[model samples]
Target: MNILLCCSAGMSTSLLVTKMEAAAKARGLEGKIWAVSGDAVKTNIDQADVLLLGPQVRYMLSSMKTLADERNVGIDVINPMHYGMMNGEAVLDHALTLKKGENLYFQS
Candidate 1:
């Protein structure tokens, strides 16, 4: 699962990627986690299985939502509190679940 993350320059989440990799490695997950410039979403969303935001990407979630939603991709945003702590584990859960979410059809 390729997780596309970050916002704007996406530098803040760059460090989050550091932590996420270790966490991802611990779980034996394949694929990768990366952060990119916000504008790249138009081009990069195709390569992404799950898309995450660091709460500062500056784009309208509404706009991006339409594109990714059409692509059948799931989107997540790292809340301020979690982002402050670099909570990759929680982020991973959300990402992985959202992956399954697309398949589960909102299993509650």
Candidate 2:
């Protein structure tokens, strides 16, 4: 699964990206996960299987959803608590779940 994380400047997400990558490595999951600023989302969205927005940028979900839908990309908001805690495992699970198209609600 190729996961893309987005934030205002993308700077805040870098640490989370490292944590998520470590979580994936620890779990033996195969994929490339990275973070980018909102401006770069369009450039990177096409390559992503799942697009997760940082809690701070959740307001852009609708617009990003429109774009993601056009390209058939899955999109979701990372739980604020999980993000604040930097719980990479939960975020990874959220991304995987969204990629699977599950209708269940995700809370952390």
lDDT per residue for candidate 2 within 29-58, as digits (tens), equals 888999887889989998998899999888
- Residues 1-108 of candidate 1: C-alpha lDDT, one tens digit per residue: 889885654456877787878888998988878887777887889899988877775355777778878988898677777788888887887888888978885652
Pairs of residues at least 3 apart in sequence or in different chains that clash in candidate 2:
none
Runs in model 1 with CA error above 4 Å? 9-11, 105-108
Model 1 TM-score is 0.86
TM-score of every model? 0.86, 0.87
What lDDT does the true structure give each of the candidates?
A: 0.78, 0.85
TM-score of 2: 0.87
lDDT of 2 at 85: 92
